[PDB]
């Protein structure tokens, strides 16, 4: 039924509400958001303010976590604004995109603890904290002393005020030196170009291991704002 790899929302992304904090150093604020993405604070640094949503009902707990993380980076900050801003995803696509990706990172991090018990060191899921978005690395190889890894990359788009998450299978190379070899490229093509059945089953496994049934994915951005997205499975005209 022409099933795809895209998980789309069903209604228009309801009005988002985010709490802002005044930060005087954007550069370290980016590292701050990267770090706090693990504790349930999904935020983006814009206009000197960290705008974020959270899944923590304890205001004191959230305040303590943010304050500690900000002190660790030598940042002068202010108090939480408690619904500082209202964001329609369509008007501000990057705000929603970054908050959504941070929430997805948090969900994947939470699932990692329980989807890695029965695994080997060459099959343990991880999140690559490098120059990319969300990347779940789940297969490792040392081909000719060249370290490579197969994983699933996630991307988010907002179209017609609706969220669309694309998960696909990508291979990456973390070798500091240059390839300069043809056998390595031959092997990398051998294992990175596959029929659309290794790829489809790879995507299915990736989604199932983090959301149970893979017909849908639920990503919680706040105590009341949850993106419940479904795979298309469109039949025909």
Partner 1 sequence: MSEYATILPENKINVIFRSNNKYHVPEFITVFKPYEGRDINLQVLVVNGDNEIYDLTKLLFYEIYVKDDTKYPWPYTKTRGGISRVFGIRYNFDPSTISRININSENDFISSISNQLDMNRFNVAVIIANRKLTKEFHDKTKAALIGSRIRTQFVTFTTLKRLKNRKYKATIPLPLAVQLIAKAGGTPWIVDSSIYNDLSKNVSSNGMLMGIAFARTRKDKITYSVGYFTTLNNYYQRFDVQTEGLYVPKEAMVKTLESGIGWYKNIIGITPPLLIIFKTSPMHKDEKEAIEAVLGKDIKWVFIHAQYNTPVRIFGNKEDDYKVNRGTVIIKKRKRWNPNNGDYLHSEIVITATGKYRKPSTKTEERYISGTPRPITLNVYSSFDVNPIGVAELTLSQIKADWEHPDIRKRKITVLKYANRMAKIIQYINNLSSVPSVDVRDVL
**What is the rounded distance in angstroms from the CA atom of residue 235 to the CA atom of residue 1?**
5
Using CB under 7 A as the binding rule, whether residue 14 contacts DNA is answered as no
The nearer residue to DNA, 79 or 196, going by C-beta atoms, is 196
194 binds RNA (CB under 7 A): yes
Residue 55: in which H helix or E strand, if any? none
Q: Which is nearer to DNA, 63 or 128 (CB)?
A: 128
Nearest residue to 119 (alpha-carbon basis) of 131, 97, 137: 137
Q: What is the dihedral angle through the alpha carbons of 116, 157, 88, 210, rounded to the nearest 10 degrees?
A: -20
Q: How far apart are CA 28 and CA 166, in angstroms?
A: 29
Contact call for residue 160 and DNA (CB under 7 A): no
* Position among 149, 156, 206, 219 found at the interface with DNA (CB under 7 A): 156
Q: Which is nearer to partner 1, 126 or 161 (CB)?
A: 161
Which helix (H) or strand (E) segment holds residue 149: the answer is strand 146-159
Determine the Cα–Cα distance for residues 166 and 170; give it in Å rounded to an integer. 12
Considering only residues 85, 115, 168, 171, which one is a binding residue for partner 1 as defined by CB under 8 A? 168
Binder of partner 1 out of 30, 63, 199, 220 (CB under 8 A): 199
The residues, any chain, with a CB within 8 Å of residue 64's CB and separated by 6 or more, are: none
| 173 lies in the site for partner 1, by CB under 8 A | no
- Name 141's bridge partners: 148
Candidate residues 126, 155, 211, 230; the one interacting with partner 1 per rule CB under 8 A = 155
Q: Is 133 in the site for DNA (CB under 7 A)?
A: yes
Task: Report, in Å, the least distance between residue 32 CB and RNA.
Answer: 14
162-173 β-sheet, strand order:
126-127, 134-143, 146-159, 162-173, 6-8, 226-231, 216-220
**Would you tell me the crossing angle of helices 26-36 and 59-72 to the nearest 10 degrees?**
130
Any contact of residue 56 with RNA (CB under 7 A)?
A: no
Partner whose binding site includes residue 2, from partner 1, RNA, DNA, none (CB under 5 to 8 Å by kind):
partner 1
160 binds, among partner 1, DNA, RNA, none (CB under 5 to 8 A by kind): partner 1
Using the 8-state DSSP alphabet, how is residue 34 labeled? Answer: H
Chosen residue from 139, 188, 216, 230 binding RNA by CB under 7 A = 188
Summarize as ranges the residues that interact with partner 1 (CB under 8 A).
1-6, 8, 90, 153, 155, 159-161, 166, 168, 193-197, 199-200, 203, 232, 234-237
Instruction: Please give the residue ranges that form the binding site for DNA (CB under 7 A).
Output: 26-27, 30-31, 34, 94, 97-98, 101-102, 131-133, 154-157, 181-182, 185-186, 189, 193
């Amino acid at each position: 039924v022409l099933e795809s790899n895209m998980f789309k929302t069903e209604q228009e992304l309801p009005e988002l509400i985010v709490n802002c904090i005044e930060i005087d150093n954007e550069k370290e604020a980016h590292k701050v958001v990267k770090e706090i993405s693990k504790y349930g604070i999904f935020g983006v640094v814009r206009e000197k303010k960290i705008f974020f949503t959270t899944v923590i009902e304890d205001d004191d707990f959230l305040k303590d976590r943010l304050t500690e993380v900000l002190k660790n980076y030598n940042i002068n900050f202010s108090d939480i604004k408690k619904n500082c801003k209202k964001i329609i995803p369509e008007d501000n696509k990057d705000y929603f995109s970054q908050i959504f990706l941070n929430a997805l990172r948090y969900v994947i991090y939470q699932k990692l603890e329980d989807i890695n018990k029965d695994k080997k060191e060459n099959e343990r899921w991880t999140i690559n904290e490098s120059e990319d978005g969300v990347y779940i690395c789940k297969e490792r190889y040392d081909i000719d002393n060249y370290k490579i890894c197969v994983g699933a990359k996630f991307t988010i788009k907002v179209f017609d005020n609706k969220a669309e998450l694309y998960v696909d299978r990508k291979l990456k190379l973390y070798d500091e030196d240059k390839k300069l070899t043809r056998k390595l490229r031959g092997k990398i093509n051998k294992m990175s170009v596959v029929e659309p059945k290794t790829r489809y089953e790879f995507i299915r496994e990736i989604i199932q291991e983090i959301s149970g049934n893979f017909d849908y994915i639920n990503i919680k951005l706040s105590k009341d704002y949850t993106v419940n997205m479904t795979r298309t499975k469109l039949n025909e005209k």
